[PDB]
Design a binder for this molecule. Structure first.
Ligand SMILES: *[C@](O)(C(=O)NCC=C)[C@@H]1CCCCCCCCC[C@H](NC(=O)N[C@H](CN2C(=O)CC(C)(C)CC2=O)C(C)(C)C)C(=O)N2C[C@H]3[C@@H]([C@H]2C(=O)N1)C3(C)C
Ligand SMILES: [Zn+2]
Lengths: 22, 181
């Protein structure tokens, strides 16, 4: 029985932001 | 502020498999809901009050991979259909609802938050139905009250003809209960 592995994440704590330029 | 969310995939098929056997996850953890995966399926695990809960019919009695190797579950409950491990170092936890709101929101595996009108202790009506393929992988995800606090965890979809009209969930109360048992 293998272990459950975290393959991603969902983040709710993000608040609107102005996508920066690179 | 309104409930908004995003998703970030931290690893792929092969790394996942290796990590499944190896039991050691060295990646960094962020978020309130982890996109969890086994060898058979993928779903969600929500961090509510220091513990990372997920749906039993997905995690079974498996261990979660951590940097310090496999982590044994701290709660298992075949009947409540729940399991829980200590929230991974890095995650942020949600807190249970304390407003008994009946207007809930479901954060899906695709980081989409959809409305569900509470119709009982474990049911809610999708104000705008979706096909089940969409809801796949969302088990163990959170059901937030308008304030963003945990009301429940998505368990099953109430569907017909391949379209989900409603949803069955695990009330935060069963977690607390499962904790004391
Ligand atoms: C999570 O565990 C996952 O996301 N799994 C990862 C990939 C699948 C799932 C989320 C549901 C995904 C959309 C639905 C996919 C089909 C599964 C249908 C099951 N629905 C169900 O049990 N509904 C009940 C009422 N009901 C039936 O009893 C039977 C049927 C087929 C006529 C339709 C129907 O509406 C409830 C009264 C319980 C609501 C379902 O969602 N599951 C069956 C099984 C697992 C979940 C599931 O796969 N959840 C259990 C333990 C409930
Ligand atoms: Zn609330």
């Amino acid at each position: 029985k293998g272990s459950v592995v975290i393959v991603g994440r969902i983040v709710l704590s993000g608040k609107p932001a102005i996508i920066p330029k690179k | 502020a309104p409930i908004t969310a995003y998703a970030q995939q931290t690893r792929g098929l092969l790394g996942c498999i290796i990590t499944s056997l190896t039991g050691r996850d060295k990646n960094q953890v962020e978020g309130e809901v982890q996109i969890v995966s086994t060898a058979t399926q993928t779903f969600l695990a929500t961090c509510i009050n220091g513990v990372c809960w997920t749906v039993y019919h997905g995690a079974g009695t498996r261990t979660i991979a951590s940097p310090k190797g496999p982590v044994i579950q701290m709660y298992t409950n075949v009947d409540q259909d729940l399991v829980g491990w200590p929230a991974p170092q890095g995650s942020r936890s949600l807190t249970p609802c304390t407003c008994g709101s009946s207007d809930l929101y479901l954060v899906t595996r695709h980081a989409d938050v959809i409305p569900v009108r509470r119709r009982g202790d474990s049911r809610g009506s999708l104000l705008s139905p979706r096909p089940i393929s969409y809801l796949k992988g969302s088990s163990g995800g959170p059901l937030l009250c308008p304030a963003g606090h945990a009301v429940g965890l998505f368990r099953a979809a109430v569907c017909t003809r391949g379209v989900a009209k409603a949803v069955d969930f695990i009330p935060v109360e069963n977690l607390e209960t499962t904790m004391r048992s």
